Amino acid sequence: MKSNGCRYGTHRVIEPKGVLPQPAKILNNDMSEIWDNEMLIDVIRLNIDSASFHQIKNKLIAQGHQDLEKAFAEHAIELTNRTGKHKNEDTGSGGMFIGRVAAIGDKFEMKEEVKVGDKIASLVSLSLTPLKINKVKKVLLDKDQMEIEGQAILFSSGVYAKLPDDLDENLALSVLDVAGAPAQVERLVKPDDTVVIIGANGKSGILCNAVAKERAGICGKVIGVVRNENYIPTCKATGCDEVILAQATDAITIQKEVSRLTNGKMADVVINVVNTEDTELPSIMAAKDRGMVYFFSMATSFTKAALGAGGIGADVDMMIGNSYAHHHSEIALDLLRRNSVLMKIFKERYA
Amino acid sequence: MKSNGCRYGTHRVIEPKGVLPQPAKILNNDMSEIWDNEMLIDVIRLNIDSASFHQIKNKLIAQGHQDLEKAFAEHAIELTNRTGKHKNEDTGSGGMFIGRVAAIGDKFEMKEEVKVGDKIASLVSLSLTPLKINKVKKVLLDKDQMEIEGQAILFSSGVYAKLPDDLDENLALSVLDVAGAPAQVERLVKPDDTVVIIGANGKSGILCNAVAKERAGICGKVIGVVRNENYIPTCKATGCDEVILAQATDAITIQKEVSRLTNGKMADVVINVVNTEDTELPSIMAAKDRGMVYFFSMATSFTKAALGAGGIGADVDMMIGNSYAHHHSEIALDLLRRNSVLMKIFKERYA
Numbered sequence A, B: 001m002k003s004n005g006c007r008y009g010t011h012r013v014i015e016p017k018g019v020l021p022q023p024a025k026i027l028n029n030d031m032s033e034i035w036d037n038e039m040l041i042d043v044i045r046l047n048i049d050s051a052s053f054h055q056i057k058n059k060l061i062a063q064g065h066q067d068l069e070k071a072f073a074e075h076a077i078e079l080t081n082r083t084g085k086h087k088n089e090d091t092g093s094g095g096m097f098i099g100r101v102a103a104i105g106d107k108f109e110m111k112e113e114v115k116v117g118d119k120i121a122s123l124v125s126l127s128l129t130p131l132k133i134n135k136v137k138k139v140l141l142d143k144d145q146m147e148i149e150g151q152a153i154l155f156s157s158g159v160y161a162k163l164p165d166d167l168d169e170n171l172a173l174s175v176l177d178v179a180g181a182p183a184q185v186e187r188l189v190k191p192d193d194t195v196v197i198i199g200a201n202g203k204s205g206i207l208c209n210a211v212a213k214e215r216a217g218i219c220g221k222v223i224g225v226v227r228n229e230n231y232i233p234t235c236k237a238t239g240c241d242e243v244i245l246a247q248a249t250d251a252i253t254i255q256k257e258v259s260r261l262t263n264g265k266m267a268d269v270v271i272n273v274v275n276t277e278d279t280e281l282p283s284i285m286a287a288k289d290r291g292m293v294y295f296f297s298m299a300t301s302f303t304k305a306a307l308g309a310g311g312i313g314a315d316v317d318m319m320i321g322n323s324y325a326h327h328h329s330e331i332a333l334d335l336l337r338r339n340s341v342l343m344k345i346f347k348e349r350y351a
């Protein structure tokens, strides 16, 4: 065991020098001796990024490979052994792994309590994960996955979730996928708040509906916004008191309907969890003066939010929805355990 | 004086229907009768967006116009008379105007107290401003301006600043450009906070240095970050207690230097005011646990911040720097009046 290791992982950066593992081109994936603050994993499955996976598979077909499953297998071994990680050299994507804990450093910053043998999922990108592929058992082209045998490093700054046996299935990775959303909502929503959730039928949306209603309480008002009227029962069943029918890009409609349902006082907290562009200005206009607008979605444009609010003189706070929060996986899993309505919907939708 | 007018200005939207003035293609620029909540301006100068201005001038030179000032003038009049506003039809950029107040609706939501005849600048984009150009006196090709005779509408939701009588105007207009930054810093920085300002020598940086230090107080710590060693005296003279020499993209150096200067405690508030990309992760890594990272610059990428913080498990708050805040023009101008050092530095650089 080697001592004084960087939680950000610079001790495993080979090329170039003085950059973090993610921007690094070549990482040190030598799993024979670990650092004091690292944690080693016996990798079971690689969930590759769907655009990265699709991109590599096509490039192998354009070079005239016949056996795509082996060619992808061939591509993975060469990529990881040369660069130390499965960072797509063209798109710069990656993914996550599922494995079992293999060794734990003495000075490892423990987040979720795990021991050797625990089955954990990774919530950080493969583009920063030291990875060594010893064998490729299967290459599922339709599942963007690889059944392998290898090992990976989690730095002390890394993020992982302990996968439960009592919760079965891939219920958890669909939850870990959006676990940062409900954890953040419970920090934002006060008792008696009026909450507007735009994209209230989505994966993270319905989790936000439930947590928002729990926090705002009996005298709070949770208002969903959805594009399609077939979604109204689900929004109300997952916590919305009222539901608006509008395109998330329809700023004027959403404003008048929120104003009507709140007698012109508007929302204290607006949660945006749609996957569409040009919904920044509608989200801003649903909020009251000095209200909170929380952007969770990757379709959010920084510039449209920052300048949009200026043009209409909207003094509201606009926060970038962090993908991580302390205990966000435990909290999101707890939410499904406490909320039977959500649990069923998740098992039906993302089993 | 027509009644029941929308503060967002939808009552002047001709094409298409049910969109805000900004995305609208054609606005109603009929200045013969105003609405009850609007304010009419006799425009003196049009400061067009420099990318929009440059693009139009080039488009006119590639179409083979000889008299460029005369060609630009006709392009402005035709665009405004056809569409009602000076929104660039290709890039979608506008700008700002300077004028004197001509008429004030009785139901106009007055922010800064102004009367008829007061010389005001507008802080909302020309891309949403109903504008009618009756004459183009001058077309300053090197200064991105047009000395015109026309009129513009300000909606109740618009933002404007009264040009001060006690001050200059080359100076005052330069401050409104960044007035949202010092106003926001005053809300974020608590007494005894450690404040890190990335881009500490810039226009907004020096305003942020001063506001951070007065708010953080004698037992607070204000740390500037600059690439160039010639900037340390200005950074320290405008409020920084310490200055780090590093590239804003150098996460590891900035992290080690903030840690060294704070005995591993890091910053309570990180203010990012560089207009360089790939500074999200350095800003995040300078913050302490649960600290605040405020992104003011338009070079900020939403996804790089949102995913960047996740990969290193940084549970920090990331705020989108709103371009507007209540009384932000008065607050930034007051800052220059109390601080002679800022005033002197501003007069030299921006006049």
Ligand SMILES: NC(=O)c1ccc[n+]([C@@H]2O[C@H](COP(=O)([O-])OP(=O)(O)OC[C@H]3O[C@@H](n4cnc5c(N)ncnc54)[C@H](OP(=O)(O)O)[C@@H]3O)[C@@H](O)[C@H]2O)c1
Residues within 6 Å of the ligand: A177, A178, A179, A180, A181, A198, A199, A200, A201, A202, A203, A204, A205, A225, A226, A227, A228, A246, A247, A248, A249, A273, A274, A275, A276, A296, A297, A298, A299, A321, A322, A323, A324, B306, B307
């Ligand atoms: N950093 C993180 O933690 C993280 C992780 C994953 C995803 N995200 C981002 O956060 C968002 C949450 O996505 P998700 O996982 O909840 O997937 P999702 O279920 O697809 O969420 C999006 C929902 O919004 C609705 N919607 C989309 N466009 C709309 C529009 N124009 N008008 C009205 N409704 C609209 C969709 O319903 P209909 O299309 O049926 O109307 C959809 O159900 C994603 O956009 C993603 O970019 C963030």
Ligand SMILES: NC(=O)c1ccc[n+]([C@@H]2O[C@H](COP(=O)([O-])OP(=O)(O)OC[C@H]3O[C@@H](n4cnc5c(N)ncnc54)[C@H](OP(=O)(O)O)[C@@H]3O)[C@@H](O)[C@H]2O)c1
Residues within 6 Å of the ligand: A306, B177, B178, B180, B198, B199, B200, B201, B202, B203, B204, B205, B225, B226, B227, B228, B246, B247, B248, B249, B273, B274, B275, B276, B296, B297, B298, B299, B321, B322, B323
């Ligand atoms: N109303 C609006 O349009 C609006 C509203 C909100 C925010 N903003 C944005 O706020 C941002 C702040 O810019 P500003 O005009 O206030 O300041 P600025 O005058 O553009 O200065 C930026 C400063 O950052 C310094 N810096 C230090 N290290 C750097 C590095 N590695 N890369 C780049 N710069 C570095 C620069 O010094 P060097 O000379 O060494 O580079 C420069 O002094 C702008 O992006 C602006 O677009 C605009």
